[PDB]
Amino acid sequence: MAPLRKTAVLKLYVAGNTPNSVRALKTLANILEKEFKGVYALKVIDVLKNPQLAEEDKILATPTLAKVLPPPVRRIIGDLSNREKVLIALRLLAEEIGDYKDDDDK
Amino acid sequence: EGRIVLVSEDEATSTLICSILTTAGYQVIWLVDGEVERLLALTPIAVLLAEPFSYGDVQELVDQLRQRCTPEQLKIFILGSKGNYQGVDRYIPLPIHPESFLQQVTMGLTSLATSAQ
């Protein structure tokens, strides 16, 4: 419990209008809140409020999940409305972050 | 009931806040301002607003949250300057310290039923 301020950040690009985009946040938050709480922080950007943000990250489709940490960064595009796929994608990410050693060398 | 939503245009402050609360067992979600529905969609136990806001009014967001959610169910905290507004449990002036921010948040959590679940 010694390590602190070491968390992974997930970015969600969505549109504040479409039900599949609005509810996407709810499905993503539900899985992360219970199964992987305190490990992943969530960041959400509304492309309808600040269009240039999407252009900066070269994203022309939503909902889009962007992985910030741990690097290298990854881009996930698909149907986030389906909790099944979302849980599956997040579970794989959990295993990747779990298998981390400090200066393993070998 | 460990979900906390932070709204601020400044990503640097938001990143630090998200990381400190998460490691403490809490989950922080950063949402962009101007979208009340998004706040409602992810209705947390407490809402953190960090100044300054260029795409919205601080008082407006506080008032809108009060109209949709009761003060006993949702708490509002403001990070920045002043913070002397109605509907706000406690304000956190800048610059902030890691220990200072966490202690204020923890103390502010002592409300409603004061229960984890």
XYZ file of all heavy atoms in Angstrom, chain A residues 2-3 6 9 13 16 20 23 29 32 35-36 42 46 53 63-65 69 75 79-80 85 100 104:
206
model
N 2.181 1.047 -0.011
C 3.142 2.153 -0.018
C 3.016 3.042 -1.268
O 2.952 4.264 -1.139
C 4.565 1.626 0.129
N 3.003 2.462 -2.501
C 2.876 3.253 -3.738
C 1.579 4.059 -3.791
O 0.512 3.566 -3.425
C 2.887 2.194 -4.848
C 3.573 1.025 -4.237
C 3.137 1.020 -2.802
N -0.129 6.360 -8.524
C 0.198 5.544 -9.688
C -1.059 4.851 -10.201
O -1.379 3.737 -9.785
C 1.271 4.510 -9.336
C 2.560 5.147 -8.859
C 3.194 5.978 -9.962
C 4.465 6.644 -9.482
N 5.105 7.460 -10.550
N -5.094 5.829 -16.763
C -6.156 6.733 -17.203
C -6.770 6.324 -18.543
O -6.067 6.140 -19.540
C -5.628 8.182 -17.313
C -6.726 9.122 -17.779
C -5.052 8.650 -15.982
N -14.232 9.405 -25.685
C -14.718 10.457 -26.563
C -16.144 10.123 -26.967
O -16.394 9.102 -27.610
C -13.812 10.607 -27.786
C -12.475 11.241 -27.462
C -11.427 10.483 -26.953
C -12.265 12.600 -27.662
C -10.210 11.061 -26.651
C -11.049 13.184 -27.364
C -10.026 12.411 -26.858
O -8.816 12.991 -26.558
N -22.637 14.359 -26.585
C -23.718 14.587 -25.637
C -25.074 14.740 -26.295
O -25.646 15.831 -26.294
N -26.845 5.989 -27.296
C -25.785 4.982 -27.276
C -24.477 5.584 -26.770
O -23.611 4.871 -26.264
C -25.585 4.366 -28.671
C -25.123 5.374 -29.711
O -25.596 6.509 -29.750
N -24.194 4.961 -30.562
N -25.404 6.587 -22.703
C -25.429 5.384 -21.868
C -24.073 4.675 -21.836
O -23.815 3.874 -20.938
C -26.511 4.416 -22.351
C -27.927 4.917 -22.114
C -28.960 3.927 -22.630
N -30.325 4.395 -22.406
C -31.409 3.709 -22.760
N -31.284 2.529 -23.356
N -32.616 4.203 -22.519
N -18.460 3.073 -16.664
C -18.299 3.399 -15.250
C -18.699 2.243 -14.339
O -18.032 1.983 -13.345
C -19.101 4.641 -14.898
N -15.883 -0.489 -14.285
C -14.676 0.032 -13.644
C -14.890 0.328 -12.157
O -13.998 0.114 -11.347
C -14.185 1.291 -14.370
C -13.592 1.052 -15.759
C -13.381 2.374 -16.482
C -12.279 0.290 -15.650
N -15.382 -3.755 -10.464
C -14.289 -4.695 -10.726
C -12.881 -4.095 -10.639
O -11.975 -4.733 -10.103
C -14.479 -5.353 -12.091
C -15.655 -6.317 -12.143
C -15.881 -6.899 -13.523
O -15.241 -6.421 -14.485
O -16.697 -7.835 -13.643
N -12.682 -2.883 -11.150
C -11.341 -2.288 -11.146
C -11.329 -0.876 -10.557
O -10.816 0.060 -11.176
C -10.781 -2.260 -12.577
C -10.968 -3.546 -13.334
C -11.846 -3.612 -14.406
C -10.271 -4.688 -12.973
C -12.025 -4.794 -15.101
C -10.447 -5.872 -13.664
C -11.324 -5.924 -14.730
N -11.102 7.737 -15.101
C -11.799 7.938 -16.362
C -11.897 9.412 -16.756
O -12.262 10.259 -15.948
C -13.200 7.325 -16.267
C -14.031 7.382 -17.546
C -13.348 6.598 -18.654
C -15.431 6.842 -17.291
N -16.501 15.641 -24.621
C -17.685 15.775 -25.468
C -17.302 16.451 -26.785
O -17.002 17.647 -26.812
C -18.770 16.585 -24.747
C -20.080 16.659 -25.517
O -20.168 16.075 -26.620
O -21.024 17.298 -25.013
N -10.925 19.357 -30.063
C -10.235 18.361 -29.237
C -10.142 17.031 -29.982
O -9.114 16.352 -29.937
C -10.943 18.143 -27.892
C -10.895 19.321 -26.920
C -11.675 19.003 -25.655
C -9.456 19.687 -26.584
N -18.614 6.348 -29.903
C -17.670 6.534 -28.787
C -16.306 5.887 -29.044
O -16.220 4.810 -29.633
C -18.365 5.836 -27.605
C -19.752 5.540 -28.072
C -19.646 5.365 -29.556
N -15.243 6.546 -28.595
C -13.891 6.019 -28.756
C -13.149 6.008 -27.419
O -13.135 7.007 -26.697
C -13.080 6.814 -29.804
O -13.712 6.710 -31.082
C -11.646 6.304 -29.912
N -12.543 4.868 -27.098
C -11.796 4.713 -25.854
C -10.295 4.811 -26.113
O -9.735 4.047 -26.901
C -12.139 3.366 -25.201
C -11.343 3.014 -23.938
C -11.595 4.031 -22.836
C -11.701 1.615 -23.461
N -2.429 5.630 -19.913
C -1.434 4.925 -19.115
C -1.931 3.525 -18.761
O -3.132 3.322 -18.590
C -1.159 5.706 -17.819
C -0.629 7.133 -18.001
C -0.615 7.869 -16.668
C 0.763 7.118 -18.612
N -5.502 2.772 -28.842
C -6.791 3.310 -29.257
C -7.795 2.176 -29.453
O -7.521 1.218 -30.175
C -6.640 4.088 -30.567
C -5.770 5.328 -30.451
C -5.573 5.991 -31.806
N -4.698 7.158 -31.728
C -5.125 8.387 -31.454
N -6.416 8.619 -31.262
N -4.260 9.391 -31.381
N -18.232 -0.852 -30.261
C -19.507 -0.631 -29.592
C -19.343 -0.732 -28.078
O -19.234 -1.827 -27.530
C -20.543 -1.653 -30.073
C -21.922 -1.400 -29.497
O -22.180 -0.263 -29.048
O -22.741 -2.342 -29.488
N -19.337 0.418 -27.410
C -19.182 0.461 -25.957
C -20.523 0.297 -25.245
O -20.573 0.193 -24.017
C -18.508 1.767 -25.529
C -17.091 1.976 -26.072
C -16.554 3.337 -25.660
C -16.161 0.870 -25.589
N -18.555 -6.773 -24.199
C -17.303 -6.440 -24.873
C -16.455 -5.497 -24.025
O -15.231 -5.629 -23.969
C -17.575 -5.808 -26.240
C -16.329 -5.673 -27.108
C -15.815 -7.029 -27.574
C -16.799 -7.712 -28.511
N -16.244 -8.973 -29.076
N 3.398 -6.382 -13.819
C 4.417 -5.345 -13.908
C 5.427 -5.489 -12.773
O 5.050 -5.594 -11.605
C 3.766 -3.958 -13.866
C 4.752 -2.810 -13.945
C 5.339 -2.460 -15.156
C 5.092 -2.077 -12.816
C 6.238 -1.413 -15.235
C 5.990 -1.031 -12.887
C 6.561 -0.702 -14.099
O 7.456 0.340 -14.172
N 12.973 -5.752 -13.311
C 13.066 -7.212 -13.324
C 14.372 -7.668 -13.982
O 15.007 -8.618 -13.523
C 11.866 -7.818 -14.059
C 11.728 -9.312 -13.830
O 12.319 -9.825 -12.856
O 11.012 -9.967 -14.617
